Scaffold this active site. Sequence first.
Site, short mmCIF file in Angstrom:
data_model
loop_
_atom_site.label_atom_id
_atom_site.label_comp_id
_atom_site.label_asym_id
_atom_site.label_seq_id
_atom_site.Cartn_x
_atom_site.Cartn_y
_atom_site.Cartn_z
N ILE A 38 49.83 27.45 46.40
CA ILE A 38 48.42 26.90 46.95
C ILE A 38 47.57 27.96 46.90
CG2 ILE A 38 47.47 26.23 49.12
CD1 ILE A 38 50.34 24.86 49.91
N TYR A 83 36.95 37.40 40.35
CA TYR A 83 37.89 37.04 41.18
C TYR A 83 37.53 37.49 42.69
CZ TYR A 83 42.84 35.70 42.14
OH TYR A 83 44.03 35.14 42.38
N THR A 120 43.96 26.62 30.24
CA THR A 120 43.43 24.99 30.49
C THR A 120 42.21 24.97 30.93
OG1 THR A 120 44.15 22.99 31.67
CG2 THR A 120 43.69 25.04 33.14
N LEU A 121 41.35 23.82 30.92
CA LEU A 121 39.94 23.84 31.11
C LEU A 121 39.92 24.16 32.57
CD1 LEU A 121 37.18 23.09 30.30
CD2 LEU A 121 37.77 20.78 30.94
N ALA A 122 38.85 24.95 32.81
CA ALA A 122 38.91 25.60 34.42
C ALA A 122 38.17 24.37 35.11
CB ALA A 122 37.78 26.89 34.21
N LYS A 140 44.67 37.65 47.96
CA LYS A 140 45.84 37.70 47.11
C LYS A 140 46.37 39.19 47.60
CE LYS A 140 46.20 33.80 44.77
NZ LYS A 140 47.33 32.88 45.14
N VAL A 172 47.43 22.66 54.48
CA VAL A 172 47.72 23.82 55.22
C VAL A 172 46.67 24.22 56.17
CG1 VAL A 172 49.62 24.37 53.64
CG2 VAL A 172 47.23 25.25 53.20
#
Lengths: 257, 257, 257, 257
Positions: free
Chosen positions: B91, B155, B193-195, B162, B64
């Site tokens: 995405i 973040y 989950t594992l980063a 975002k 993209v």
Amino acid sequence: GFLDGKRILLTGLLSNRSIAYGIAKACKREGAELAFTYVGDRFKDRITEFAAEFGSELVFPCDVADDAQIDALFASLKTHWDSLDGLVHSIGFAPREAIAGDFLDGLTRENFRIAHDISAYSFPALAKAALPMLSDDASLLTLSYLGAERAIPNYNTMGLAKAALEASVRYLAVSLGAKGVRVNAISAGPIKTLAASGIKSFGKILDFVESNSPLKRNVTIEQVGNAGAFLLSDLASGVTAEVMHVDSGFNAVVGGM
Amino acid sequence: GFLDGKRILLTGLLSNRSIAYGIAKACKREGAELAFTYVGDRFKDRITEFAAEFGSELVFPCDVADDAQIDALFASLKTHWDSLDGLVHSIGFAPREAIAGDFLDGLTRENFRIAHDISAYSFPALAKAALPMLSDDASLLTLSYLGAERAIPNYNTMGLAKAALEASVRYLAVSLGAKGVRVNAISAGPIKTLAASGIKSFGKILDFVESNSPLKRNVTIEQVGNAGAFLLSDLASGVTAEVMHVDSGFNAVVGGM
Amino acid sequence: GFLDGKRILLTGLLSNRSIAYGIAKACKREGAELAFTYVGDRFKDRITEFAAEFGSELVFPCDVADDAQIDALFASLKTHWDSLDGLVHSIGFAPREAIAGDFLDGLTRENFRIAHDISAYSFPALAKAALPMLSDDASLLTLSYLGAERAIPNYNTMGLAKAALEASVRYLAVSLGAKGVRVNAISAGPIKTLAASGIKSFGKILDFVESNSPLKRNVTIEQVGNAGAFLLSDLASGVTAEVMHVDSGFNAVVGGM
Amino acid sequence: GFLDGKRILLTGLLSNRSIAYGIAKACKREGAELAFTYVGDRFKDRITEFAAEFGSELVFPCDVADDAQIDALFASLKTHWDSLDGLVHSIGFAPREAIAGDFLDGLTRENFRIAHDISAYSFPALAKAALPMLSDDASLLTLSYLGAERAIPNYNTMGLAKAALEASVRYLAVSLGAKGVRVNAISAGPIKTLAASGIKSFGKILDFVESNSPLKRNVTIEQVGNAGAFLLSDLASGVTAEVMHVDSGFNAVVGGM
Ligand SMILES: NC(=O)C1=CN([C@@H]2O[C@H](COP(=O)(O)OP(=O)(O)OC[C@H]3O[C@@H](n4cnc5c(N)ncnc54)[C@H](O)[C@@H]3O)[C@@H](O)[C@H]2O)C=CC1
Ligand SMILES: NC(=O)C1=CN([C@@H]2O[C@H](COP(=O)(O)OP(=O)(O)OC[C@H]3O[C@@H](n4cnc5c(N)ncnc54)[C@H](O)[C@@H]3O)[C@@H](O)[C@H]2O)C=CC1
Ligand SMILES: NC(=O)C1=CN([C@@H]2O[C@H](COP(=O)(O)OP(=O)(O)OC[C@H]3O[C@@H](n4cnc5c(N)ncnc54)[C@H](O)[C@@H]3O)[C@@H](O)[C@H]2O)C=CC1
Ligand SMILES: NC(=O)C1=CN([C@@H]2O[C@H](COP(=O)(O)OP(=O)(O)OC[C@H]3O[C@@H](n4cnc5c(N)ncnc54)[C@H](O)[C@@H]3O)[C@@H](O)[C@H]2O)C=CC1
Ligand SMILES: CCCCCCc1cc(=O)c(Oc2ccc(N)cc2C)cn1C
Ligand SMILES: CCCCCCc1cc(=O)c(Oc2ccc(N)cc2C)cn1C
Ligand SMILES: CCCCCCc1cc(=O)c(Oc2ccc(N)cc2C)cn1C
Ligand SMILES: CCCCCCc1cc(=O)c(Oc2ccc(N)cc2C)cn1C
């Protein structure tokens, strides 16, 4: 006054209808020492005249699209001031088509990029370049609009950029806060003037705010200026990461029904 | 099922821990016909296997970052489907340093640009390229995170992107709504989950959500998937311009005190 | 269907234009077993007919102004159902003068008290009385309106009560969440019907939503019903403490300018 | 000072740790003329001493549970002042059990009623009783807390009441705004003191705010006072219907992770 001795740099003072002009006038009234930026050599005389009106010869060029000019701005300012107590970011731009008509019609990768680069990125970029010389109790201020929060006709790509800008207020507040620096925005209502080339007429919006806001009137640069001076001052030492509406209360209603 | 006959394109299905995987599984269960995108030729076999698991051979490459690939995606899809009923934008990307440690430390013009280009711009860009073939009652869905609304450690630049993405949900909803098309986001809680390389460990955040959210548990891709399937469906025909939290209620509390 | 076997109690089903009617219809379609409340003996025959339409004879009186009737409701229901899986709170009332004309003109201590007692307090009151028999994965749902968030003409004292109601959604979600129970609201758009005695005409609001919402149409009880059924179901197991707008996107715009 | 000549009535000045004390001190500094209310005859001497400290003998009893005392307050004040320029509503109460432990455990109809009656209703009730003598540019101010916006442990029923109070700020702003009167709240952070009988210890919250707020410190009554003085003044003439956080930025983060 409540800003006695505070040294404050203001960007974006283009004319006497600029929000930055209202902020400068209130800051000077309350005892601040001011410095100013401009972009475009043809504006050097005009900004120098404005600076003199506010008792200052501290004028520096800075196109915030340019990393080198951002660094040079603070190097230049530092030759005059050991520290900076306030920064007013009153800089916005989106390409004409990106803020007129349908949102997708005016959406291109480059229009998106420029709007976010100039209107959003430039605020924390200035903050980062300024950081070494920021006083521990410095206060940084930017300007946003209700279009960041809710979809307003034509605001389009600028609404996205302003949402990113308001988020940057929050992340900056965390980054700079342990030092003691505060970071806030004013979400200003529309300011009545002839819409410049590149901006669609917002006469209908001005009429709608006058008819529907709680105070039944549009806000002025004097009102936005005084709120800005307050936020830049130690009166506001408990306030950071805030987006303060100075808009006659318009954000808080559902008008026109 | 409640998505019988709906033709839905999903981006961002990278592994079986992808939010897009949970969405695909729920959409297929409810009767949807699916198509998939991928980026990177080394992933062609993997995404083709996933597509087959969901009864489809409709797989297309699309980075993209590239205007030509976006246009080519829909030209390719159109050779199979007269119309598109759903689009899942799953995405996200921000450069490693821009989402680790101090916000300003990882802030550069290029990091800002890339994070907003890939994570924000790409959603309305896909919507615009898809528009000629979107059904009148199509539904477009993206994924966001609480970091758009409040400052969350690390973040950083992704929080800005975002915020712009959530604003794009609102402006897209206005642009596409008269046609009848709906546009929404899910603000998903963290998925255990594992980063991956490029992302900082968020184990402490997962523990904090498990300890402090109203439901005292982290959300799963199955839960996010079902909410996504709902929003893509005619069950949600009254819902547009919404950012729906699917996060065990964590956004609504002040935890850890 | 996605509510197979779920036992759900619905309050506030007064007519076939009731939001609770749309919710009941969707819940029954998706496999739920239903029970109903009513207030006023003259409505016993009508609610019994509605219950039969939805395959149930489980009808109970309950004026939520009365502690004893609240307790009796659940004692009665318990003689039929070991556990309760869903509760729909579709009960609102404010005195006529308190929702017409100027906010302060219709403000009295008693009008304030009644509006908050019936429209706000009654939701967590029902939740508390139900708690011993709530299933661990039960889902509680209430209905609010945009007037809780922003000032809307005439909504007045009801806007205050709905703000308290939305806050109760959040505090209930924390209180009941460790058990596993979810608590949400739908912020519904206006539903087109003749405004009953005690409620001012909202025709202008309906016209304004039709002209200005992203989807350019008013929401229906079917649309609110399907969103409600979703929230009551295990499809929504990741969702709690949420106020979901089902309003054609109207909350997300500044219309009429 | 910026409140020269402004006549301002302050409620809720109980001790020198009262938020109203910080507001009074800042208002007096900026040139205001003050008047004070109290409840309970045993406090008459104390409030009279505070009033004298702020250059005033204007002290009046008013239990806001009582309609007659509300009316009598303004009749009494009117014998001294032709008009009222400011009103500070710094009155809150919820029964001990309703703000300790589990939300539903402390929920009763009467606890709900009292918390909303005293903490919420009393603000627009005072505004309505004051209206005949309010100056056209008067400013009314109340105090709220983040618990109105998100669920905070123990705040419980007070969170509901504060949500209704913040809604009342918006509806009051519309009602009084055409006249020219402004209405705002400060959402104050916690103020460090020993928690009085009836209030649970909030030491852990104070520690958490000090550790996690952007400014890494708790707010003071001086900081809340200065923000209050600003909002009561003509500096804030563009600001109404606003809930301003004065909380070291704590509302804007997700802390403790
Ligand atoms: N004018 C209004 O109704 C409202 C304006 N705002 C925001 O207030 C701020 C100021 O706007 P105004 O005073 O009204 O207009 P303005 O035109 O007087 O100020 C905009 C400034 O941005 C500067 N600028 C644009 N590109 C720049 C670059 N590459 N480098 C350095 N400066 C650049 C301009 O030179 C100008 O000084 C903007 O952020 C605007 O978005 C917000 C709300 C309402
Ligand atoms: N994983 C989590 O805890 C949470 C994730 N989100 C968001 O959910 C969405 C999906 O994330 P995940 O499934 O968890 O991770 P993921 O890694 O499995 O999905 C990210 C996708 O973005 C794609 N992508 C990155 N750059 C691209 C480009 N230039 N062109 C086309 N695709 C590109 C990746 O190939 C990958 O498929 C993202 O937007 C993420 O920000 C939101 C909240 C929580
Ligand atoms: N109708 C609309 O446009 C919208 C309605 N809402 C909310 O949706 C909910 C349902 O409203 P509607 O279905 O439209 O109207 P409705 O009149 O059909 O339902 C209201 C119900 O409240 C019940 N009720 C009133 N006092 C009661 C008491 N003391 N004890 C037990 N029940 C009592 C009524 O009997 C009636 O069943 C209400 O909370 C309303 O505020 C929200 C948004 C929009
Ligand atoms: N103290 C804190 O951390 C924070 C307090 N607030 C709010 O600030 C306001 C002031 O609180 P504080 O100064 O801290 O405590 P405070 O105890 O000193 O003030 C509360 C006042 O309410 C008055 N009051 C209670 N029932 C009354 C009645 N029936 N009639 C007339 N007055 C009555 C009390 O006499 C007292 O003067 C309250 O609304 C409180 O909820 C908000 C945020 C934080
Ligand atoms: C489309 C919605 C009307 C906007 C009303 C208020 C408003 C909000 C603004 O953000 C704005 O600022 C600009 C916008 C665009 C550009 N290129 C440059 C600037 C400085 C001006 N005005 C007037
Ligand atoms: C720093 C805060 C923790 C984030 C928790 C939730 C969270 C939020 C996200 O947005 C996210 O997605 C990415 C983030 C960055 C990149 N480069 C690529 C992706 C796909 C993952 N996760 C796990
Ligand atoms: C004044 C603003 C218009 C409201 C539009 C939407 C709206 C919102 C509502 O909350 C509503 O419900 C009631 C309101 C009052 C009473 N006594 C009883 C009820 C059931 C009806 N409607 C129609
Ligand atoms: C439970 C959450 C902690 C509250 C922290 C801040 C806080 C918020 C408040 O609203 C508050 O005020 C009161 C609360 C109750 C009563 N009966 C009376 C009053 C005056 C005090 N404090 C200290």
